[model samples]
Target: MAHAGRTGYDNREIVMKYIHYKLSQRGYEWDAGDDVEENRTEAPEGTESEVVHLTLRQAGDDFSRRYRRDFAEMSSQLHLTPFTARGRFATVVEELFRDGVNWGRIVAFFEFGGVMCVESVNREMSPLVDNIALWMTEYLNRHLHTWIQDNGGWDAFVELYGPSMRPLFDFSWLSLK
Candidate 1:
């Protein structure tokens, strides 16, 4: 497989721009540093995968809503600070990707983000949710972007997890049992 430029469109700055754009659109105030350029191109080809990222984000939001009480309970029990939670989030995601990347693991990844979001709110560190979102975006741009493109990108996620998937999975992969 050709390697050099397969991920040109997966540029880090571009991905960070997309995340800041999305978060700002949702009313979150993000501090996007001072290196802004006026002539930067917007939304190159592979960056269109932002749609998939957004869809996964919505799924995570839904997961948090559906399991709000459980997450709240767990949050109380864990007694974790936002910083610790962030570290744990990165560790778990790193482990998930270590085995190999797949749609199922990808879904798990988002759901775990959801869990942290809920925990953040429950712990009264709601502001951290936005940072969590940013972390997730950074992880994707750094580690998963190439694999995502190689496996058919946004359309594949939509086809597999579309409305027909309904309640998503039965938590079989999640191992709720």
Candidate 2:
């Protein structure tokens, strides 16, 4: 690919800016210090086919990161009490589904944000049901990262559907992220 005005790196930064813009519009704050665990010693197990695992996992994780950043912001902007917040977020999850997002991204949103909303709703269901909702979040969060790594390293995520990588992947024999 021909370098843009700044360099190849500038082009990549613009994609990241678009990513940041998506999160911001969704009411998420950009936190460079956000609690993303970027390093893991091992990969997680997954049942999905290799292609979906590779392509969708990155987008999912990206959504999760933004979701977390937006949590406090959404809570305030919606002027929500616990009950209403849970109700609102549940609707958000359903709306995302109806919008036809990739399954992996939805699952990631669930693990990171959706389950929390469910927990809030289920809290009134019964103690047992609430605990089950809690368990779902914990379980998926653990498994998803491992699954991400198993398909490709953390950096592999950097390339998914990225224009920067299109020519690179098409032209180069070896992978670069």
Candidate 3:
């Protein structure tokens, strides 16, 4: 879907749609992080981080294909995946293997409704939910450390993980005159 002079599409939007759709096909949740559904979320307040465990089958290439197509059409980079942030989580998960998150195990975070006041988008993204604690409790913490550090996330990598961040929770995006 290269936009070699096509004058009729917003590529970024289409890519986001594709990501949403593909996740749907996986029985995984795809939330836009715009809501505050308190009841639907099992995350606690001090829970600064959560784990995202993904076992990308061979079809994982589909995600890259869609991503490339979207970027090509838009003529701009698609910075939606939060890879750096995800990398941070991966790093921490590696460390938490040996150390720990000061909690039980990794918890996933997907909130909605309370912030955006939109329709039930959160309800649609319930499948991506899972128990990382269960995944970790099955593995050796030291092994996780090797996996993360070898993957280019060394010490202090958690600094890149910004799961606690909210892009619109404040008016700070606009500077005062």
| Highest-scoring model, TM-score | 1
Question: Which pairs, if any, clash in model 1?
Answer: none
Q: What are the models' TM-scores? A: 0.57, 0.29, 0.20
What lDDT tens digits, residue by residue, belong to model 2 across residues 58-165? 444444455555543443333324546445544654444444433344344433342343333333433322333343344334444454445453334444533244
Candidates' C-alpha lDDT: 0.59, 0.37, 0.28
| Candidate 1 residue lDDT tens string, 1-177 | 676442334334433444455445445544545445576766575554555555554555455577657655654565557658677776778667766888767766666654555555556676766677667777877678878888766567756665456767523233221
Arranged by lDDT with the best first, the candidates are 1, 2, 3
How many clashing pairs does model 1 include? 0
Q: Report the Cα lDDT for residue 58, model 2.
A: 42
Measured by lDDT, the strongest candidate is 1
Q: Which ten residues in a row have the lowest lDDT in candidate 3?
A: 109-118
lDDT of 2 at 53: 32
lDDT of 1: 0.59
Q: 10-54 in candidate 3: lDDT tens per residue?
A: 222322333444445545455635335566766564222221211
